[PDB]
Amino acid sequence: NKIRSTIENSFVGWELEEVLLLDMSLDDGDSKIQNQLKKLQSPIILLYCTK
């Protein structure tokens, strides 16, 4: 929410390319996670996950 709000309020040309919310705690979803990782490829990417 903070990222989106500061992107919208800003006058700078920031272009968000999709949001990745894959869960690593799921079972048998490793192939889906790999597919999503392959699909998404950007020079700059932020991460929000545990250690």
Place this chain on the structure above:
Amino acid sequence: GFCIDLLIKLARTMNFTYEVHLVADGKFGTQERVNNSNKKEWNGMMGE
């Protein structure tokens, strides 16, 4: 004037009232900074 007659013509086929309120800024207004942060806010006409 012109636009007033247009809205009167609109009224006779829409069954609604009106209370004219003239602008309090005297401008059309464009996308401008809020002068408090980086946010851009509407001024002039469209903000009203």
